[PDB]
Ligand binder design. Structure first.
Ligand SMILES: CC[N+](CC)(CC)Cc1ccccc1
Ligand SMILES: [Mg+2]
Ligand SMILES: [Mg+2]
Ligand SMILES: [Mg+2]
Length: 340
């Protein structure tokens, strides 16, 4: 029962959900990882971890991934949500120094995760553990691209810290650019490749159809999060949300801003369907009767398939996850799963 302001019939009719067979063990293993890495208090892990659906989200995304790859992705992604919470709490507590030091350690750990596996900040240690494992799947050229992308992501989170401390709501276009980094568009595009077992040549992953399909998948997901997380973000004095940029800088009502965000989300779907056809045509061309061409074509088909799976996984995640159920919280402004 999706609220009509949030319901997308095209997703419900034409993007059937998919689920990785490892998900039952994935849910248990990531929960244990959160406990053993002390990324959330044990009582909050017990009450909320499964209800947050972080493993469900990724198991509906990276279909076909080796179990060990999916486990590293799920641990990294659960860490990422907890990092978003830490970021938020440092902002509302005014802990500029604590955030600066964390930001610095993540940059260093990103380049040398082994050195940081037992850092006193368990949030740094958990990052290092998941990143070191992600670095063990593909050649070092893929590792360097992941690092390059995530250095940029950290600095976008730092820009958000300064915005919220200074009381700045970004403009629409500045927000749209920033959001491709705070949502980690290019990290989760990178992770398609270990999931299908193949570092893609630049001429393949930078093909205009591959690049556009990857972009639209993430824009849909980011803007649909904006639509669904707007209530809890308004309650929490978050300022980063396409709807908030529209209300602040364009005199839209709340109902009008929600309408504009929804129509932009909808356009992502139908733009994706067009480029998806082009990307699969490119896959057909790559299958030229050679083993390498069969390998590249198969990787493109899997990766573009998972770009499509991202639509349905993100859609249902926002209605199943306790992360967004602000009407059920004792304090709408302080979600019960965050460490305050
Ligand atoms: C890993 C989660 N993420 C990615 C940067 C930060 C919170 C946003 C996200 C929210 C909801 C669904 C998917 C991704
Ligand atoms: Mg957030
Ligand atoms: Mg955030
Ligand atoms: Mg959000």
């Amino acid at each position: 029962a999706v609220p009509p302001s949030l319901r997308l019939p095209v997703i419900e009719a034409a993007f059937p959900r998919q689920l990785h067979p490892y998900w039952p063990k994935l849910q248990e293993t990531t929960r244990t990882w959160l406990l053993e890495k002390r990324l959330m208090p044990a009582d909050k892990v017990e009450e909320y971890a499964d209800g947050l659906c972080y493993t469900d989200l990724m198991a509906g995304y990276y279909l076909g991934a080796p179990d060990e790859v999916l486990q590293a992705i799920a641990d990294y992604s659960a860490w990422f949500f907890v990092w978003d919470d830490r970021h938020d709490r440092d902002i509302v507590h005014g802990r500029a120094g604590a955030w600066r030091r964390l930001r610095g350690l993540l940059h260093t750990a990103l380049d040398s995760p082994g050195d940081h596996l037992h850092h006193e900040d368990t949030l740094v240690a958990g990052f290092a553990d998941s990143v070191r494992r992600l670095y063990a799947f593909l050649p070092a050229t893929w590792n360097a691209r992941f690092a390059r992308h995530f250095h940029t992501v950290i600095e976008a989170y730092d820009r958000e810290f300064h915005n919220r401390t200074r009381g700045i709501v970004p403009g629409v276009e500045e927000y749209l650019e920033l959001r491709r980094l705070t949502f980690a568009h290019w990290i989760y595009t990178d992770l398609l490749e270990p999931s299908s077992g193949c570092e893609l040549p630049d001429a393949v992953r930078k093909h205009p159809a591959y690049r556009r399909a990857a972009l639209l998948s993430q824009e849909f997901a980011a803007w649909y999060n904006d639509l669904c997380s707007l209530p809890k973000e308004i309650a929490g004095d978050e300022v980063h949300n396409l709807g908030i940029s529209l209300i602040t800088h364009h005199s839209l009502t709340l109902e009008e801003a929600i309408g504009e965000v929804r129509r932009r989300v909808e356009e992502c779907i139908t733009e994706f369907l067009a480029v998806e056809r082009d990307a699969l045509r490119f896959a057909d061309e790559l299958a030229d009767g050679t083993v390498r061409g069969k390998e590249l074509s198969g990787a493109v088909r899997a990766n573009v398939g998972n770009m499509r799976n991202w639509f349905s996984s993100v859609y249902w995640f926002h209605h199943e996850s306790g992360r967004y159920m602000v009407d059920s919280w004792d304090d709408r402004s302080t979600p019960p799963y965050v460490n305050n």
